[PDB]
Structure 1
Amino acid sequence: TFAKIKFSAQIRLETGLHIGGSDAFAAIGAIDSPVIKDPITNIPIIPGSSLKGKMRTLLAKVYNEKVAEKPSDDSDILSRLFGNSKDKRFKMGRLIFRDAFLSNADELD
């Protein structure tokens, strides 16, 4: 009737990425867009907005039936997984992500 499925995993980075954050003040040697971190502490963290915006794009190009043009209006077979602000049959999404935090500080030092 109503179940809760939590996909707990550990994202391992094999190659250093580069995602721009807010302002260019993460250190004393920046000149371009740095990396988003934590407003309280000083640990490089990755938000959850970049995961939904990238996984949906790479998935809607093989599981679709029509050439897309605008978001929330392509491939109805997967629109119920992320959401749709135009279809009256559903509005809320059934896939809630989470801002991944760096928990590798217990053995990095």
Structure 2
Amino acid sequence: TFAKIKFSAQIRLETGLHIGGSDAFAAIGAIDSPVIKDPITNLPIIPGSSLKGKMRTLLAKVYNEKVAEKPSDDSDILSRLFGNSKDKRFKMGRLIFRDAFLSNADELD
């Protein structure tokens, strides 16, 4: 059965978040450590690469049953969802992450 399930949620920060972007890329920021933003709305975002990497690192301490010096000698559980470039049968995972844009700018205003 070919289906696609979509875990949707609202990530509410409970402390200040600093994902951090390049100084000249996310606009020229006067501050020394700017956060990553949307190139048009100039609102902070949570890129899907951030969530994917942090989730893979966290589940790499639980569902690995061993240690890995690279994200290639990983468990089948992590490879099947996030992907492994050197494995033929998991060259792309079953999880697709998305950028998380600001959703409550009205409420903040």
Question: Which TM-score band applies after superposition, normalised by the shorter structure?
Answer: 0.7 to 0.9
User: What is the Cα deviation at residue 78 of structure 1?
Assistant: 2.4
1:29, 1:36 → 2: CA distance?
10
1:65, 1:76 → 2: CA distance?
11
User: What is the Cα deviation at residue 28 of structure 1?
Assistant: 8.5
Alpha-carbon spacing, 1:32–1:8, altered in 2? closer, same or farther (3 Å): same
Instruction: Give the conservation status (yes or no) of the 8 Å contact 1:24–1:30.
Output: no
Q: Which runs of 5+ in 1 are unaligned?
A: none
Alpha-carbon spacing, 1:48–1:73, altered in 2? closer, same or farther (3 Å): same
User: What is the Cα deviation at residue 68 of structure 1?
Assistant: 1.0
TM-score (norm: length of structure 2): 0.87
User: What is the Cα deviation at residue 67 of structure 1?
Assistant: 1.6
TM-score (norm: length of structure 1): 0.87
Alpha-carbon spacing, 1:52–1:25, altered in 2? closer, same or farther (3 Å): closer
Moved more, 36-45 or 22-31: 22-31
Structure 1 vs Structure 2 CA RMSD: 2.1
User: What is the Cα deviation at residue 107 of structure 1?
Assistant: 1.9
Match of 1:30 in 2: 30
1:95, 1:68 → 2: CA distance?
21
Alpha-carbon spacing, 1:24–1:33, altered in 2? closer, same or farther (3 Å): farther
Instruction: Give the conservation status (yes or no) of the 8 Å contact 1:36–1:44.
Output: yes
Q: Percent of counterpart pairs with the same letter?
A: 99
Alpha-carbon spacing, 1:29–1:54, altered in 2? closer, same or farther (3 Å): closer
- Alpha-carbon displacement from aligned partner over 1:82-108 (angstroms, at most 9, x marks no partner): 101111222121100100000101222
Which 4+ stretches in 1 moved above 3 angstroms? 24-29
Q: Which runs of 5+ in 2 are unaligned?
A: none
1:61-80 residue pairs with structure 2 within 5 A? 61-80=61-80
Rg: which structure is higher? 1
